[PDB]
Write a protein that binds this ligand. Sequence first.
Ligand code: CLA
Ligand code: CLA
Ligand code: CLA
Ligand code: CLA
Ligand code: CLA
Ligand code: CLA
Ligand code: BCR
Ligand code: BCR
Ligand code: LMU
Lengths: 41, 227, 213, 220, 86, 312
Amino acid sequence: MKDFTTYLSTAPVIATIWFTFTAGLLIEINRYFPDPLVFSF
Amino acid sequence: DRKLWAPGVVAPEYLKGDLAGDYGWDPLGLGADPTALKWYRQSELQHARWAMLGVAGVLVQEIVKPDVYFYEAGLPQNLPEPFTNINMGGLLAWEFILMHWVEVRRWQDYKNFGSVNEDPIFKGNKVPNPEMGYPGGIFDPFGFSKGNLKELQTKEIKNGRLAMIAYMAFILQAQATGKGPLAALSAHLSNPFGNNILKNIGTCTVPHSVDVQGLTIPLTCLWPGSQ
Amino acid sequence: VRPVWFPGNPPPAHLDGSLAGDYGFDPLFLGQEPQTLKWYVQAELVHGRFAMLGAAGIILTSIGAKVGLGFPEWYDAGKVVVEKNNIDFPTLMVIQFYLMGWAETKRWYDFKNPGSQADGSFLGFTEEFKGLENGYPGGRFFDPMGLSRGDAAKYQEYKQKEVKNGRLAMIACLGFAAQYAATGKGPLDNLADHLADPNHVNFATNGVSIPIA
Amino acid sequence: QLYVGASQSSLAYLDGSLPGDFGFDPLGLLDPVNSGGFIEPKWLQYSEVIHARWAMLGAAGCIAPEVLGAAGLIPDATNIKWFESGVIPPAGSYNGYWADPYTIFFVEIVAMQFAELRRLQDFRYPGSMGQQYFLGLEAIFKGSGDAAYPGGPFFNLFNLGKTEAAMKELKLKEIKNGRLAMLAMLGYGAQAVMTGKGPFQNLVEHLADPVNNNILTNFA
Amino acid sequence: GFIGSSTNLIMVASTTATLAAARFGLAPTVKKNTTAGLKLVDSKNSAGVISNDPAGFTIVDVLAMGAAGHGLGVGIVLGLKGIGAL
Amino acid sequence: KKVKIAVDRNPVETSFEKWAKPGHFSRTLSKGPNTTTWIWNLHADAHDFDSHTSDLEEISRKVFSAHFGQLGIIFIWLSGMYFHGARFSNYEAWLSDPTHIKPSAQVVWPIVGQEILNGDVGGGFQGIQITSGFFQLWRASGITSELQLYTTAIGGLVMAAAMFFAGWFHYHKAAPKLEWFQNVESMLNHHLGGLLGLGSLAWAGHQIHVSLPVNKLLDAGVDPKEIPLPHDLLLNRAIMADLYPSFAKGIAPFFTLNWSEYSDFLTFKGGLNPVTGGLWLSDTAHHHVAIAVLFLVAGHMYRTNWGIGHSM
Ligand code: CLA
Ligand code: CLA
Ligand code: CLA
Ligand code: CLA
Ligand code: CLA
Ligand code: CLA
Ligand SMILES: CC1=C(/C=C/C(C)=C/C=C/C(C)=C/C=C/C=C(C)/C=C/C=C(C)/C=C/C2=C(C)CCCC2(C)C)C(C)(C)CCC1
Ligand SMILES: CC1=C(/C=C/C(C)=C/C=C/C(C)=C/C=C/C=C(C)/C=C/C=C(C)/C=C/C2=C(C)CCCC2(C)C)C(C)(C)CCC1
Ligand SMILES: CCCCCCCCCCCCO[C@H]1O[C@H](CO)[C@@H](O[C@H]2O[C@H](CO)[C@@H](O)[C@H](O)[C@H]2O)[C@H](O)[C@H]1O
């Protein structure tokens, strides 16, 4: 499955995975630390 | 191998008549492996001899004392007077050890043929071994061998196949009509159209469980139906 | 030629009959690359050894709870242990992760560098941590009895037995999980309920496993 | 070709070498030219034979309880119509099996998975199934060059059809009884839907008053 | 009783009429098509198909004309039921 | 014969090596990117199958399998709608009071304050008021339960898997030849008689047996839990005869051409149901029967393999 993992390394798939990751990280940060208007913690 | 089990069949090329009672049947091809064929011949002899002893025992036990069901004779409260209500644990211990010895000896004769012939205590005494499964000597004390051995093996295995069929018949009849072999035969002769495998199959007279000195043996039947 | 998981089907080229428990089972071709296959071999062995330990522990503690000894079920033993003994679960978890991190990082960096871990850096231990094969470390510490050493056919038979009991124990732990999620009771409670009435007491008679009826 | 409905187009490839080759291929599915997938002649003949054997097991099993209860040889509890046996619980189910229908269905799943996948692997790889250990049973699973007729020590248990002409006649009889039984099973289903009664009950009711018990009078 | 009804006789008459029209060269069949001007002419049949009739009347022809006659008879029956003539 | 199944066996190897080579389908894109115009052209030319090759056979095969992909995606979408109606819906509440409860089949997660979009639609439910008409369509089909929607979703996922398998199969395993696509007469015969004729006939049957009784009981004020399930109406002819007496006569009036007996559930009322404001489902059933017959006769118009029919 060298070719399949080459496909997963393509720009659109890697972009989808990375932005799902970034968006999920931000979403979980905003779930556990809701409404962060200022850096106070 | 001559006069096979069916008019138009051919014998497999591993069944050529060198074993007794060879009708060349093997429809599942289980004896295609020679190792497995040796082992299955040994298991055939074991099942055959134990089943001959079994039908002999059930028959002679019904003839001597018809008071006792052979399906329930293993229960300790139905045992003879020197053994009635004996502790089945010590009994099972006796049997377990005394049979482990002899069956491991037989198994080592299977694995290394001709290696457990000598007595291990009095090392002057050797059972012979013409074939695997036919020790002889102290097991052939009357000396019916050193004559027609192949014909006697054929007789043995034929009567043994018949006795296997007959003992499973005994067991299934005892499970269906709740009677012993000769009791079932006389019940058939009493009414040979209202008492047969019809109107008796579908009903299992064996209880769902049996209490034996504290244990509860699960006590199944060989087919489903009516308790 | 060799037993395959799907008789008739030829085995894939990357699954030569060399690894323990090689039955040509790779429909998704996950171990097609050799280095990935070594990684997955060690993963299978670690999973299976942890699962063998877990199945053995669940089975033993279930036996003890079933015969009446002072044992909880496997799904309740963590709480019972940290509350009977006044054990701080965070402390226990971080100690576990410290020790398992040491061990598993040693694992990882012997996989990345097999020649490593045997220089004497840990405590002077050189040959106790060199590793015999991938997934089979060996030595006087991981193989104190020397069963890999000496008889080689016995060693291959033991590799087969290890991987197969490991796959069976992985299936068994998956079964423990599913049986808790379905029947809500212990594994040997499930077994006794099945041995009581083999019919009418199985996965087809929970209403969870088969929702048709 | 014989069998009206046959065509000069179908006789181009229906040489008469297959059992039951009566030229009837009006939709031309057995044409080997540019035909793959499952419309391959091999697979279609195989499936005809398989549907045939399953269907003439079922054509006897759907009628057998009713016939044997009409004769009084089985009790009235097992004397049932085939669709109220548990196969279609809405139409009725039998309560007195040793297990509930889904336990038995899982046993059926495992058993038939084994059997039918062995069968499939012998169709895909003919020389197979006699190569891997199966408790010694692989000696009878060698099959033949043909998938629908393995004919080993078990599948040809009495070695019937020893010559080629006898084997051909027997294959023809098999496929003819099987086509008859496939139609009989289609009819069992159609009669159960229309009349709501068993096939033997329908036969008896048609033999009593045929003019007033037919497909036309049963439309109401 | 339906057998003997007006509906039954209409339907059998229509079906037999279409069958006899096709069989005896008054309707397009499998073997005879029509041109743009409705004159019966030999077709190519697109498969070739065997029948022992003196005219090559296939069971495909019986099906086609049974469907045509069933449509005719259904329309006739239900239109006489519509205008009240039945 | 001229109209036949014609396919190439294993024309294309199922392999991931061309996934890893973007622009394989083009000779001008297989050379790799040097500019971003390549990145845009790779997407503009992805489905221009007649610019990949020039022979009509491979074009048609690509088109067929891509249609299978589109159908699988539509099935995923439909199964998603049915599933969101089964899990994230107020449909069972909406059946009991459709004049006050706003249909909603999408619930929003409470993450960044967006749980305000989960509005008070009714039925003890908070979600997005949908505008798709799926609730009314399901009530017309006679659903009356979330379990039926869930199983329709599962069936839709099964059919999507079937469609994707069929695309893979009809491109990679047994791909039809060009002469198979050019059987436009048979294609039209089957798409008129089968796709539209048998389809309309099957929907008419559903309406005869499931939609009409369920909605006649729903319009009679019967709570959806007291309504017989569709299979109880299929099996028990007495219930249907109690709702529509013509069912007492069976299918005999159909074969005896006494079709007016079926004027209970095959009507020509026209207008609207005054209880629901929708069309009479008896009129709709009769409609679908009529157009089923119409399309089934229309699908016997073109000449395929026997002498009858037309050459277009
Ligand atoms: C290690 C094997 C093992 C054993 C001995 C048992 C034994 C038992 N199980 Mg458990 N179980 C297992 C595995 C096992 N299970 C696994 C893996 C699952 C998850 C699917 C379950 C889920 C489960 C449930 C939900 C229930 C039981 C129950 C039971 C009891 C009755 C049997 C039954 O209901 O059928 C269950 C039998 C099986 C699920 C089959 C055994 C496992 C198969 C052979 C694994 C096959 C894996 C395959 C090789 C590879 C998978 C990949 C492939 C799909 C590509 C019995 C004590 C019931 C109970 O509690 O009894 C009262 C019950 O309700 N089991
Ligand atoms: C647009 C739809 C479509 C079209 C036009 C085709 C066309 C074709 N297929 Mg493909 N196929 C499709 C969808 C389609 N298929 C789907 C969705 C699947 C996955 C399930 C398949 C799986 C498939 C396989 C595995 C094979 C074909 C084959 C064929 C060829 C001959 C089929 C034939 O005449 O048999 C006539 C049809 C049958 C015998 C099928 C009867 C049984 C089905 C299930 C009933 C039809 C469904 C019905 C319309 C709706 C349900 C009704 C029910 C409720 C009563 C032909 C090229 C065969 C071939 O030669 O390879 C190319 C072949 O081996 N197809
Ligand atoms: C009337 C139906 C019929 C006929 C004519 C045939 C004919 C044939 N079959 Mg088919 N077959 C059938 C039904 C039939 N079969 C069914 C229902 C099954 C599914 C169970 C099979 C499964 C099957 C397999 C798997 C194979 C055959 C093979 C054969 C050939 C070998 C000769 C034979 O079967 O004996 C001729 C048939 C008869 C004389 C029919 C007698 C019917 C009675 C009622 C059966 C006897 C019952 C008896 C209790 C059976 C057990 C005996 C013993 C164990 C107690 C021949 C072409 C083999 C072959 O082609 O190998 C070359 C082969 O491999 N068939
Ligand atoms: C049955 C419907 C159908 C089919 C099968 C085709 C098929 C085709 N068209 Mg045609 N087309 C259609 C409908 C259809 N089109 C419609 C409705 C329009 C009017 C809009 C067009 C207008 C059109 C033009 C103008 C051209 C084609 C071309 C093509 C070919 C290649 C298209 C391609 O590679 O794009 C691949 C797919 C894309 C590039 C994706 C486009 C994405 C769009 C622009 C955004 C919309 C997405 C979404 C709805 C908006 C929200 C997104 C969200 C993320 C914000 C192909 C033969 C081209 C051709 O043949 O070149 C010679 C060409 O030049 N088509
Ligand atoms: C894992 C299975 C598998 C594999 C390995 C292949 C492999 C191949 N296929 Mg086959 N194919 C498959 C499944 C598979 N296919 C299925 C299921 C279908 C039916 C749709 C097809 C239909 C098909 C056609 C019609 C063609 C191929 C072609 C190819 C070749 C390259 C395709 C490519 O670049 O892929 C990479 C492409 C993708 C990953 C795109 C997938 C797009 C999917 C189907 C739709 C997803 C839409 C999505 C939901 C939109 C979201 C929008 C977003 C904003 C949310 C290669 C030999 C092409 C070729 O030239 O072969 C020689 C060709 O013309 N295949
Ligand atoms: C496709 C559409 C469709 C379908 C499926 C049905 C189906 C049905 N209708 Mg409806 N109906 C329809 C359209 C439809 N109808 C239309 C358009 C009208 C208006 C004219 C009607 C008017 C109507 C009335 C007035 C009545 C029905 C009735 C019925 C039922 C009786 C069927 C019957 O007697 O025919 C006979 C059908 C068959 C004999 C086919 C059965 C064949 C089976 C499936 C064969 C399978 C056997 C298999 C090979 C072997 C077994 C498999 C396995 C176990 C081994 C049935 C549920 C009647 C009823 O009782 O309703 C509740 C009734 O009174 N229908
Ligand atoms: C043998 C022979 C004979 C006889 C024969 C016969 C008698 C035949 C018959 C035939 C027939 C008797 C046929 C029939 C057919 C039918 C059909 C084919 C039907 C169809 C139907 C349909 C198609 C329907 C449709 C529809 C519907 C359902 C509804 C309404 C609408 C419509 C109409 C569309 C003769 C002469 C003597 C001589 C020799 C040969
Ligand atoms: C919604 C949906 C779904 C489901 C669907 C369904 C469920 C469907 C069904 C369908 C069906 C269920 C169909 C059926 C059909 C049937 C038919 C179509 C029939 C026909 C018949 C006929 C045509 C007849 C003819 C005739 C007569 C009349 C008499 C005698 C003779 C003859 C046979 C010729 C799913 C899941 C996919 C998902 C998506 C969506
Ligand atoms: C070819 C097109 C049709 C394809 C098959 C259609 C699918 C049918 C699914 C099975 C439905 C079973 O139900 C179908 O047969 C039953 C048995 O006679 C009928 O049941 C009816 O007849 C029974 C026997 O007299 C009695 O219980 C009642 O009179 C009545 O319930 C149903 O009225 C009919 O709808």
